[PDB]
Amino acid sequence: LLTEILLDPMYDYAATVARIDGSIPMHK
Amino acid sequence: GEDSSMDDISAYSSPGLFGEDIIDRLDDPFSIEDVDISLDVLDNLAPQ
Amino acid sequence: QRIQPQFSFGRTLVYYPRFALEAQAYGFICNSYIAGLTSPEFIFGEMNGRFDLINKALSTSSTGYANRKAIFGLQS
Amino acid sequence: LIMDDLVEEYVETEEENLVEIVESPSICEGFVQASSQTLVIIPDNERITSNVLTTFEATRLVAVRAQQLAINGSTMLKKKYSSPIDIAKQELFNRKIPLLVMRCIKVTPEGQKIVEIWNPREMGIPLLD
Amino acid sequence: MKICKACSSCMVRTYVDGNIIFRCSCGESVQGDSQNLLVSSKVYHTGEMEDKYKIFIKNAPFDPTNCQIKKDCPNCHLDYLTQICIGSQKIIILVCRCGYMSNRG
Amino acid sequence: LRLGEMEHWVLTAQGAMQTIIEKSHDDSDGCISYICRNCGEPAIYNASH
Amino acid sequence: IVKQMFNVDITYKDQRDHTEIDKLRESVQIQFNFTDVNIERPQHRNYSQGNKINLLPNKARLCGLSYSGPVNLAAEVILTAHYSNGRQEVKRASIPPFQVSTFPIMRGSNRCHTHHLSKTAKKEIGEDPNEPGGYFIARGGEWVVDLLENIRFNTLHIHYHTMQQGNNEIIRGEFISQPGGAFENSSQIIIRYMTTGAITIEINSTKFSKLRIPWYLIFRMFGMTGDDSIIEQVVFDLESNSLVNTFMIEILEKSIHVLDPIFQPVQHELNREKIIQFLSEKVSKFVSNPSAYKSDENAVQYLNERQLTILDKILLPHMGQTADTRVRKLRFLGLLIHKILLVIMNVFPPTDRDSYRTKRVHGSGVSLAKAFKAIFNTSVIAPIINGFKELLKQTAFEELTQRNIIEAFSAALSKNTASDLNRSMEQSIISGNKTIMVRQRPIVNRVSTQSLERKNLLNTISALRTVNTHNTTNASKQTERADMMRRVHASYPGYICVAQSADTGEKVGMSKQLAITANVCTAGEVLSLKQRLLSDPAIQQLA
Amino acid sequence: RKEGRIRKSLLGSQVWSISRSTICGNSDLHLDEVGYPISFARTLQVAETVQHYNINRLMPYFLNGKRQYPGCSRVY
Amino acid sequence: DFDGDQMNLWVPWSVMSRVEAELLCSVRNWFISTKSSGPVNGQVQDSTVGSFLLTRTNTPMGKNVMNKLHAMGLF
Ligand SMILES: [Mg+2]
Ligand SMILES: [Zn+2]
Ligand SMILES: [Zn+2]
């Protein structure tokens, strides 16, 4: 399931905007 | 007349050239059939 | 022979009138390379330039058939 | 189902104009075996081939001698060498090669192989250099 | 060309015996006198420079792409004429939009 | 990597052999074949068995 | 294409006799049409049971998926049961809009998820902000549909028979006629002038193939059986002598009187019905008995009416597709014969095979339209056709309910196929080969394809601006033709780059490039201009 | 045909112990000399039999092995 | 030429092939063209003009001479 979502590009977009806001740690 | 169920699917591909129906037996003057040169070294045929 | 009127009946290019008698209409290039060819001079030069590229590609394949036929006739 | 990558088709268009009762015996016909030949060595005074080794024949002599020096080790060179190629080459040049050149000129229908055996030590040596 | 007066069909010629007698598929015959005896003909260097280019010559003064020369038109005295080259004979014709045709063509 | 027809023709023109033997047999699909010499047909030979 | 062109009227004749009504009935007419079709943006099943979340192009490229948009179809099915004694039972069903297909979506098109997205959104979605798109994402690779260079439709192409093989022929004139826009199916007619003097007209379309008809036979099929009228239609005048009309008249006479081996029974016949029957018998399939059907008047009438409808739809469709336009079709055909015979006189030279005035460039839309119509036929209609045949095998015809009809229609498109429109469209995109076999039939793929080699953005843009002639079956033989089609032509300047070409090997001059300012037009409003021309007082109509 | 048994497998062959690379100019090489990269020289090998006359010469090749050039990795 | 040409190179390992390669197929035998009976090789481009410049009488500076150190450097 994760491999279907983690390779989904909008998750990278959703992740990179959470990193900017600092909602998630910068690394993985 | 109005059926397309066994429409000949070859006529769907409209003709592209003029004499497509003529079988021609003269070999292509650009083929490398009788020239035994490898595909990777085809750059050796390049001009300069 | 000079450039043939292939654009239309009596025309060599869209840049020249029908049945033009000037030598430039039939491929006579007046400029030199260092001077810089004009647009129709370059087109005529490209017709000669491509026609040399076609001859090369024919040369490799045409001689390949003759070379193999000649080898087998003579190899023994 | 579009398959594509067809195996084509191949066409040949030419003609090869290659210009007592009898029954089936098994000994008159057949005989795939060829009759054993007898070797006729042309006398040394009747040989009409070149007394100088061709570059082909000299190269063959050197190659054969070098291979045999690769399997054996015996030679007649006073000056020792580290390579069989050098030993064979100098053996040819010094005229002490233990090989003979048999030049075959005939196959007689009577089962007769006519040859000229040439001694490389008495023959001229080509350039090879 | 002979067409049947009743069937409107092309009739064979049927040269029998001392005369020419056309025959239709309907069996009608009309025969032929004098001017029907031309079986075949061929004229060399004819049918060229009259019928092949008549439309082209007529439209040439109106063609923008035709070459033009500085020469007075006898009829309308226009300073320019339309120059035309036709055939392997390279016949030069000067035509004008006024209908002047150089009497050649 | 291929030694096509033309390479063989060139080596033959040079009268090579041996190099042709080496490349075409030793460094290629060189096998050893057995013929009966009596019927001319391929035969079965084995030294181990 | 789906609505106007994909209409089905197929009749089956069973042998099932398990009920009195089953014995009384040996016929069934399957008839259906679609009026709904729409391609929506690509979807992906996130966990095999989701709500088909959006599929972005980078997900397709990374995971090897196909960036294809699903195809939603709705069809109206009419089933008619035919019995003896003239009875006719009809079952009608309307199918809800169903989806079993996906169509590949070109990146950047209005059905692509990045059609109007911002450049920054494209940047963070994994796409190229500066690239324009124009390619397809299929099975882990990016594919570009090139500009296939095609000859001009509705144009008479006349070329001398300079092939030096099978020279029993003299000059040939082909005319590919298209009923309208790009997507209407074209019917090609070939006019051959023969050494024996005959002038044979061959029509190649759906219903016709490799069948050569004498010209006068086609002319008098539509009435006008008088030879005078035919000669007047060709030469335009039998009363002005001239030197050109004399030659055309004499050679048309020679063609009229030539005995062809195949059409001997109806060659001399002046009866329109007999000729229509003969051609229908020869050209229509599924009629194996040539004598059994003749004793039934209604079978004769059916064959004649079907043949007349076919000839209405196949002979010069651009001239019209109605019976009232048949005489003007005869006028146009006479004009074509007149042009060919003028060219024979050396009065006109043959058509330039390489001049770009008589050439068109078909890209993405047209090539995919043709490939899609063929593939949709094979992988949609035939599944449905066989499913309905088996359904009639399983169940009595009046016993069929509304729900069963839809089950057999939708299920037939599902089993063992399940994607084949998408898979076959992908195969056409990937291959682009000028010889493919679909359902074991040697057809040609007119889709100019090319793998997207991203060496640089210049390479990508040049690839998307590339015009390929793409030699088909019966390619260039050893002649001047292989040289002339590679030369820079005098019509190239301004539209085809005079300089750009492959500098090596077979591809020298084979692949052309659009000039910097050249553009490819779409189909215009032909109807408005035609109406304005007809309303113009300066133009006198054919009538 | 060219890809057939005769023209592809009999009249020609795929061979081992062969290398291919781009050529380039070296004015410091004799006309009868070719510049062979050391990566290719360590890949292709020359079969030298061991005898009394060459055992001294082949010892440095044998001792080096794969570790140093000139070396060798195969012994029959 | 060196515009991207690729040429095959295989090193003989058999003694018969190695003996053959140096004795028979060495390039010294192809110096004279079998086709034309003339030489195949010579000076090309950089050296054909280099031989002319070396052997010409007068340079634009003056007489074409060099001192001992630069005459030695030519060798
Ligand atoms: Mg090169
Ligand atoms: Zn009549
Ligand atoms: Zn005037």
Q: Residues near F17 by Cβ (< 8 Å), separated by ≥ 6?
A: I20
* C60:B45 CB<8 A: yes
**Touch H-F: 3+ C-beta pairs under 8 A:** yes
- Return all residues near B37 (Cβ < 8 A) that are at least 6 apart: B44, B45, F4, F6
Sign, CA torsion C36/C39/C40/C43? positive
Contact yes or no, A with D (3+ CB pairs under 8 Å): no
Which bound ligand lies closest to the C-alpha atom of E99? 3
Give the number of C-alpha atoms closer than 13 A to the C-alpha of residue D126, restricted to the C-beta side.
15
Q: How far apart, in Å, are the Cα atoms of B43 and each of B37, E8, G504?
A: 10, 70, 8
Q: In terms of DSSP H, where are the helices of G413-480?
A: 420-431, 457-464
Cα distances (Å, whole numbers) of residue E68 to C19, C33, E55, E79, E90: 9, 31, 18, 10, 16
Shortest distance, CA D49 to any CA of chain H (angstroms): 33
- Are D126 and D58 in contact by the 8 Å Cβ rule? The answer is yes
| CA-based nearest residue to E8, from G323, G255, G216, G197 | G216
Residue G366 has a CB neighbour count (10 Å cut-off) of 22
**Is D93 within 8 Å of chain H by CB?**
no
What are H15's strand-pairing partners? none
What whole-number distance in Å separates Cα of residue G383 and Cα of residue G389? Answer: 10
Q: How was this structure determined?
A: cryo-EM
Residue G144's nearest CA partner among G371, G453, G427 is: G453
> With contact defined as beta carbons under 8 Å apart, do G445 and G484 qualify?
no
Contacts of residue G529, defined as CB under 8 A and 6 or more positions apart, other chains included, come to none
d(CA G505, CA C61): 9
Dihedral pair phi/psi, residue A18, rounded to 5°: -75, -35
**Torsional sign, CA G268, G271, G275, G281:** negative
Sign of CA dihedral G365, G368, G374, G376: negative
Q: Which residues make Cβ contacts (< 8 Å) with residue G160, sequence separation at least 6?
A: G170, G171, G350
- DSSP single-letter state for residue C18: B
**C47: closest chain G residue by CA:** G488
What stretch of H or E contains G44? Answer: strand G43-44
Instruction: Provide the H-helix boundaries in C1-76.
Output: 39-74
The Cα–Cα gap between H31 and H40 comes to: 21
Spell out which residues of chain E touch residue G226, defining contact as CB-CB under 8 Å: 7-9
Sort strands D38-41 and D112-118 into parallel, antiparallel or unpaired.
parallel
Check if D62 contacts I (Cβ < 8 Å). yes
- CA–CA separation, D122 and G372 (whole Å): 84
Q: How far is CA D32 from the centre of its chain?
A: 23
Q: Are C3 and C16 in contact (CB under 8 A)?
A: no
Sign of CA dihedral H35, H39, H45, H50: positive
For the beta carbon of residue G179, count every other beta carbon within 10 angstroms: 19
**How far apart, in whole angstroms, are the C-alpha atoms of residue G279 and residue G257?**
20
Which residue of H3, H5, H49, H53 is the best one to mutate when testing the D interface, meaning the one whose CB has the most D CBs within 10 A? Answer: H53
Residue owning tokens 């209005």: G110
d(CA D117, CA D102): 4
Q: From residue E88, give the alpha-carbon distance in Å to each of D50, D95, E45, E92.
A: 69, 81, 11, 11
- Cα distances from G231 to residues E4, G228, G247, G250, G337, in angstroms, run 13, 5, 12, 10, 10
First to last CA, chain D: 67
Task: For residue B44, give the ligand nearest its CA.
Answer: 1
Q: Which helix or strand (DSSP H or E) is residue G232 part of?
A: helix G227-235
Beta-strand relationship, G199-204 and G442-443: unpaired
Distance G196 CA to ligand 2 centre (A): 24
**Integer CA distances (angstroms), D24 to D27, D28, D32, D33, F40, in order:** 9, 9, 16, 19, 20
Q: How many CB atoms lie within 10 A of CB H34?
A: 11
- SS3 string, G121-160, reads HHHHHCCCCCCCCCCEEECCEEEEECEEEEECCCCEEEEC
Residues 6+ apart with CB under 8 A from C17: C11, C25, E65, E66, E67, E68
Among all chains, which residue has been given the structure tokens 């007419």? Answer: G29
User: What are the phi and psi torsion angles at G256 (to 5°)?
Assistant: -65, -40
Report the gap between the CA of B34 and the closest CA in chain F (Å). Answer: 9
End-to-end CA distance of chain B: 60
Phi, psi of G296 (to 5 degrees): -105, 120
3-state secondary structure of G107: coil
Q: How many Å separate Cα G77 from the centre of its chain?
A: 25
Residue G379 and residue G421: Cα distance in Å, rounded?
6
- Work out the burial of residue E90: count CB atoms within 10 Å of its CB; fewer than 13 is exposed, 13-18 middle, 19 or more buried: exposed
C-beta atoms of H54 and D84 within 8 A:
yes
d(CA A15, CA G413): 41
Task: Please list every residue in chain H whose beta carbon sits closer than 8 Å to the beta carbon of residue B36.
Answer: 2, 7, 12
| Residue in the block written with tokens 């024919």 | C58
Question: Which numbered ligand comes closest to the C-alpha of G503?
Answer: 1
d(CA G147, CA E22) in angstroms, rounded, equals: 58
Residue numbers in E near C19 (CB within 8 A): 66-67, 83-85
- Rounded (5°) CA angle C35-C36-C39: 145
Q: Which residues of B touch G473 (CB under 8 A)?
A: 20
Strand stretches in G57-207, DSSP E: 68-82, 88-94, 102-104, 136-138, 141-145, 147-151, 156-159, 169-177, 187-194, 199-204
In angstroms, the CA D57 to CA D101 distance is 8
Which residues, including other chains, have CB under 8 Å from residue G202's CB and lie 6 or more apart? G189, G190, G191, G192, G210, G211, G212, G213
User: Is G494–C14 a contact, with Cβ atoms under 8 angstroms apart?
Assistant: yes
The H helix count followed by the E strand count for chain D is 2, 3
Find the C12 Cα to ligand 3 centroid distance in Å.
27
DSSP state of E13: -
Chain F nearest C-alpha distance from C50 (Å): 29
- Say if residues G267 and G257 touch (Cβ distance below 8 Å): no
Q: How far apart, in whole angstroms, are the C-alpha atoms of residue C4 and residue G187?
A: 35
CA–centroid distance, B42 to ligand 1, in Å, is 10
Which residues in chain G have their CB less than 8 angstroms from residue D6's CB?
435-437, 442
To 10 degrees, the CA torsion angle through G494, G500, G502, G508? 30
**CA-based nearest distance H38→chain F, Å:** 20
| Rounded-to-integer distance, Cα D37 and Cα D29, Å | 20
Chain I interface mutation, best of B36, B38, B40, B48, highest count of I Cβ atoms under 10 Å:
B48
Q: How far apart are the first and last CA of chain E?
A: 30
Q: Is D115 at the interface with chain I, CB within 8 A?
A: no
CA G278 to chain centre: 26
Q: In this structure, how many other beta carbons lie within 10 angstroms of the beta carbon of residue D81?
A: 17
Cα E55 from Cα G333, distance rounded (Å) = 22
CB of D58 closer than 8 Å to CB of D64 = no
What count of other Cβ atoms lies within 10 Å of the Cβ of residue C27?
Answer: 19
